[PDB]
Amino acid sequence: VKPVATVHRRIPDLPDCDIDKWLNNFNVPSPLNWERKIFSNCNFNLSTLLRLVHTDSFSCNNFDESKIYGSCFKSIVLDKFAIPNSRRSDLQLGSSGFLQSSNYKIDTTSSSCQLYYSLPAINVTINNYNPSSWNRRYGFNNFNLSSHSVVYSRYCFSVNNTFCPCAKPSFASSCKSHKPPSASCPIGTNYRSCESTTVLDHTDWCRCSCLPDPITAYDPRSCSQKKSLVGVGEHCAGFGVDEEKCGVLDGSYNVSCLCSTDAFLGWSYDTCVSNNRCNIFSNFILNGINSGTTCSNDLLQPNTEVFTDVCVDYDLYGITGQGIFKEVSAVYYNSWQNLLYDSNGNIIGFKDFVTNKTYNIFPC
Numbered sequence: 197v198k199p200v201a202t203v204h205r206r207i208p209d210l211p212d213c214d215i216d217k218w219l220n221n222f223n224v225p226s227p228l229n230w231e232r233k234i235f236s237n238c239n240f241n242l243s244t245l246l247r248l249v250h251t252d253s254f255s256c257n258n259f260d261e262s263k264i265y266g267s268c269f270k271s272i273v274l275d276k277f278a279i280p281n282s283r284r285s286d287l288q289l290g291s292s293g294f295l296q297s298s299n300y301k302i303d304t305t306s307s308s309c310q311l312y313y314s315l316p317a318i319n320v321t322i323n324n325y326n327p328s329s330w331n332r333r334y335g336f337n338n339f340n341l342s343s344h345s346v347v348y349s350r351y352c353f354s355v356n357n358t359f360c361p362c363a364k365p366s367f368a369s370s371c372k373s374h375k376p377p378s379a380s381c382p383i384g385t386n387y388r389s390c391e392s393t394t395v396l397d398h399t400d401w402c403r404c405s406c407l408p409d410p411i412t413a414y415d416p417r418s419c420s421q422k423k424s425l426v427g428v429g430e431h432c433a434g435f436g437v438d439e440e441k442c443g444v445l446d447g448s449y450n451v452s453c454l455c456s457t458d459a460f461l462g463w464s465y466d467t468c469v470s471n472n473r474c475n476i477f478s479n480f481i482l483n484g485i486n487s488g489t490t491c492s493n494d495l496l497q498p499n500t501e502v503f504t505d506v507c508v509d510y511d512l513y514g515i516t517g518q519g520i521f522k523e524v525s526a527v528y529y530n531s532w533q534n535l536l537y538d539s540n541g542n543i544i545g546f547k548d549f550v551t552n553k554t555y556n557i558f559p560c
């Protein structure tokens with residue numbers, strides 16, 4: 197870990213981070229649409245936080261939880277979502293289950309903490325939201341689910357920007373066996389790939405891509421929906437669509453390509469409620485330990501001396517460097533701010549808010 201600077205001063209009047217207010221928001225997202233908030237340049241209290249959220253468990257990975265208290269970070273990145281009861285074990289670090297394959301991958305290389313907490317069920321409304329623009333482009337609007345149902349994707353699929361799920365009306369019109377539904381595709385997209393053959397006594401046997409469906413496809417290579425595991429920081433690329441439920445039978449070019457709601461596959465849901473509270477997950481990413489101005493107020497930090505006349509590494513109101521400090525009478529401190537810069541933008545002076553002493557800073 198990068199050590200704390202020998203001369204360190206915090207910015208004195210920063211606002212509270214209010215992490216608990218965000219975690220306790222009653223509009224709780226599902227893992228499908230996990231929410232992120234970045235906290236910076238503010239003071240937080242881990243001890244208070246764990247009491248104000250009804251914490252069940254808190255632990256850290258690649259970091260010592262006990263070292264958070266009294267520390268400063270460049271930023272704290274918080275991700276959160278309600279936990280479907282059946283998926284809880286998916287959140288073990290490194291797990292290949294549904295939550296981390298297809299909704300939210302917990303980064304195991306960063307310094308992070310995982311907080312398990314809960315909210316009273318009667319006040320909670322789950323926000324299930326499909327993040328996939330291509331799903332939405334072709335018909336997906338909302339879920340229609342009980343209160344406290346929490347959606348999760350099982351399988352995600354990506355497509356390129358020329359994707360369209362509907363067979364071409366001109367192609368479908370001559371099919372006699374297994375005619376696909378059809379519609380016009382947007383300009384700049386390619387119609388669903390389809391072929392007509394004879395076979396046995398079927399003169400016009402039509403088959404298109406992604407059969408039986410993109411999850412169980414006989415031939416993934418010819419299906420334009422491509423399996424995709426979520427990476428760190430990503431959301432599900434999209435539910436696979438049953439292309440046989442996109443368009444309409446005998447649809448012409450006057451109907452726009454749209455997939456029925458039940459065409460979107462590979463997802464499920466479970467309640468988050470146990471003991472009449474909704475169980476929630478949050479992940480903390482700790483960026484730049486022992487730097488920055490996102491600082492714990494859990495401790496009465498006893499401010500140390502401003503060591504003078506010696507080369508010193510410093511972290512002053514968020515700005516870092518090394519130099520020699522020499523105390524000066526106030527007359528020689530040529531500015532009104534707590535830091536003093538030269539023509540080239542380098543720090544040449546410092547006022548200590550703790551003592552009101554003023555210092556020149558020289559290079560080592």
Ligand SMILES: OC[C@H]1O[C@@](CO)(O[C@H]2O[C@H](CO)[C@@H](O)[C@H](O)[C@H]2O)[C@@H](O)[C@@H]1O
Pocket residue numbers: 523524525528
């Ligand atoms: O006797 C000079 C003495 O004063 C210091 C501050 O303690 O420097 C100040 O005085 C100089 C004026 O002659 C300025 O050039 C300088 O910028 C100002 O800070 C010391 O640096 C010096 O020993």
Ligand SMILES: *[C@@H]1O[C@H](CO)[C@@H](O)[C@H](O)[C@H]1NC(C)=O
Pocket residue numbers: 318319
């Ligand atoms: C939760 O809901 C109940 C009933 O709807 C209400 O009485 C209570 O004040 C709510 N709690 C909060 C914190 O809003």
Ligand SMILES: *[C@@H]1O[C@H](CO)[C@@H](O)[C@H](O)[C@H]1NC(C)=O
Pocket residue numbers: 340341
């Ligand atoms: C939503 O689901 C319920 C069943 O839980 C059903 O009765 C209702 O018709 C559905 N509404 C819509 C708009 O699909």
Ligand SMILES: *[C@@H]1O[C@H](CO)[C@@H](O)[C@H](O)[C@H]1NC(C)=O
Pocket residue numbers: 356357358359386420
């Ligand atoms: C999308 O993939 C298909 C592969 O069948 C290809 O024909 C099409 O040109 C691709 N579009 C882009 C923009 O890469």
Ligand SMILES: *[C@@H]1O[C@H](CO)[C@@H](O)[C@H](O)[C@H]1NC(C)=O
Pocket residue numbers: 212241243244493494495
């Ligand atoms: C942080 O915790 C300390 C130690 O109990 C307390 O003195 C201080 O008031 C707390 N600050 C906030 C903003 O909760």
Ligand SMILES: [Mg+2]
Pocket residue numbers: 212213214235236238
């Ligand atoms: Mg804030």
Ligand SMILES: [Mg+2]
Pocket residue numbers: 359360361386387388389405420
């Ligand atoms: Mg296609």
Ligand SMILES: [Mg+2]
Pocket residue numbers: 416417
């Ligand atoms: Mg292949």
Ligand SMILES: [Mg+2]
Pocket residue numbers: 294350464
């Ligand atoms: Mg399942």
Ligand SMILES: [Mg+2]
Pocket residue numbers: 273274275479480481
């Ligand atoms: Mg995070």
Ligand SMILES: [Mg+2]
Pocket residue numbers: 524528556
């Ligand atoms: Mg001087």
